[PDB]
């Protein structure tokens, strides 16, 4: 993207001033779209001395004459050439600029246009810029951020000491990671991605992307009329324990609610009985255990059950002890079907196993399980897309690291999911996702593809809950899934 402005200037020959101009007017038009007619408003434009501020000067100049008032507070020491050009124009067109920030100047304005720092923030905002960002945040005025809210690191979404909380962010070309990962995503407000004249080739050459509605629509498997359950595949879910009788039902149903033909659960007796008492459409095979947990004595029975399915999901509610450990590692090692590995399957996994497996795998950890899995702290793995990338690539798998933004990666292509809400922050929601993913593999999508579609639909089902999200539970989420799908199409 920094490579992209460069390329469009240096190779394609677009004057950098033209790119700047297009940036600034696009902010003006985005504000108008959001606020209605802008002539009622007094605008306080906050400008640093890099090109982010230059963008600001464009905005400020283009409001001169059309709005009730415009003031620019300039807060940089030096000005980049384009910023300098544009300060020069602002002044020639009659615009007013001050360099000192009086706490009280917020009183005489309605909108703050925040053009202090963009992609060129390095390290921490302290001093004058700190005070000022805090002042705007305490002010209750309408805040519009140019490109990125000043103080979000645009590569991680990290807050550098402090950061502008925007109502609207207008970014150029493509969204940056800091709009997509938290806390940055939270401080972006409504995000608009403006087209400022980059060639389409370049825009699309981006190694990472947000999972969009159009992308999932085109990945959905076809439903040919002449079909039967076999067309839509078979899933086995190896799950449950005397501690966790409910997890398997949630997985099984996630598989069914996404269109799979046949879902066979394999769960310790009598816990298997639970599944069909609530949803008798599931088949729930009783497995005879010594203690209520899977062990090596169930390995062969499970490999037999796997011979006639298309994908196996393993992990929800298995329990985390040494019997489950021996079992899950010997099973995965010998299973020559695609595997979806989740939950306690992940907790006891030896990862050499993934390396020595000829068949493919998706792992679906939350950051607790990821931390454990790679022997790192929760804070180190959270939103760490490079770590996720290096892990997928290394172990020949797909990683789905679940979070409010979920990362989905295979080591080459990385997608970010942004559908969902805090009703998914509740036990069981992950167990539903494992089934969805297994279900889409079963219907012939690749692991990356199934995983992409699944996190999108899963999040979107949560959003369609008709009452407060905090009351959502995994059973309701199951019901909303076929609605997410209909609404997708």
């Amino acid at each position: 993207m920094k490579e992209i402005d460069e390329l469009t200037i240096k190779e394609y020959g677009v004057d950098s001033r033209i790119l700047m101009e297009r940036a600034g007017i696009s902010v003006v038009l985005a504000m108008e779209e959001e606020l209605g007619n802008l002539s009622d408003y007094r605008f306080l434009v906050l400008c640093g001395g890099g090109n982010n501020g230059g963008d600001g000067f464009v905005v400020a100049r283009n409001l001169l004459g059309v709005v009730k008032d415009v003031l620019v507070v300039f807060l940089g020491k030096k000005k980049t050439p384009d910023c300098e050009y544009n300060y020069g124009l602002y002044k020639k067109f009659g615009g007013k600029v001050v360099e000192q920030f009086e706490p009280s100047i917020l009183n005489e304005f309605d909108v703050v246009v925040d053009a202090i720092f963009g992609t060129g923030l390095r390290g921490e905002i302290t001093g004058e810029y700190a005070e000022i960002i805090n002042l705007v945040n305490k002010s209750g005025k309408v805040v519009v951020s140019v490109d990125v809210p000043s103080g979000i690191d645009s590569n991680t979404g990290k807050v550098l000491r402090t950061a502008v909380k925007a109502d609207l962010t207008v970014t150029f070309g493509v969204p940056k990671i800091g709009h997509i990962l938290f806390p940055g995503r939270d401080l972006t407000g409504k995000l608009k991605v403006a087209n400022i004249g980059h060639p389409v080739h370049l825009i699309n050459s981006i190694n990472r992307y947000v999972i969009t509605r159009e992308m999932v629509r085109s990945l959905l498997p076809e439903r040919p009329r002449d079909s039967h359950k076999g067309t839509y595949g078979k899933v086995l879910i190896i799950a449950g324990s005397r501690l966790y009788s409910g997890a398997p039902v949630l997985s099984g149903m996630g598989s069914l609610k996404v269109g799979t033909g046949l879902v066979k659960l394999a769960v310790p007796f009598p816990q298997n009985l639970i599944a069909t008492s609530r949803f008798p459409e599931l088949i729930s095979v009783p497995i005879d255990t010594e203690k209520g947990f899977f062990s090596l004595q169930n390995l062969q029975e499970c490999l037999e059950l796997s011979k006639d399915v298309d994908v196996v999901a393993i992990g929800p509610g298995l329990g985390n002890n040494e019997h489950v450990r021996e079992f899950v590692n010997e099973f995965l090692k010998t299973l020559e079907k695609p595997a979806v590995i989740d939950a306690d399957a992940i907790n006891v996994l030896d990862t050499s196993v993934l390396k020595e497996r000829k068949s493919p795998a998706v792992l679906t950890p939350h950051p607790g399980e990821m931390a454990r899995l790679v022997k790192k702290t929760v804070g180190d793995v959270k939103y760490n897309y490079e770590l996720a990338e290096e892990f997928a690539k290394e172990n020949d798998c797909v990683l789905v690291l679940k979070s409010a933004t979920t990362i989905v990666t295979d080591g080459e292509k990385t997608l970010f999911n942004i559908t969902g809400n805090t009703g998914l922050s509740k036990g069981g929601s992950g167990d539903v996702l494992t089934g969805m993913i297994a279900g889409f593999i079963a219907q012939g999508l690749s692991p990356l593809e199934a995983s992409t579609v699944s996190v999108y639909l899963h999040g979107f089902a949560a959003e369609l809950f008709e009452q407060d999200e905090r009351g959502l539970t995994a059973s309701e989420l199951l019901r909303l899934i076929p609605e997410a799908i209909r609404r997708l199409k």
Binding site: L29, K190, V193, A194
Partner: peptide
């Protein structure tokens, strides 16, 4: 659609 994308 031309200018913006949300």
């Amino acid at each position: 659609a031309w200018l913006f994308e949300a």
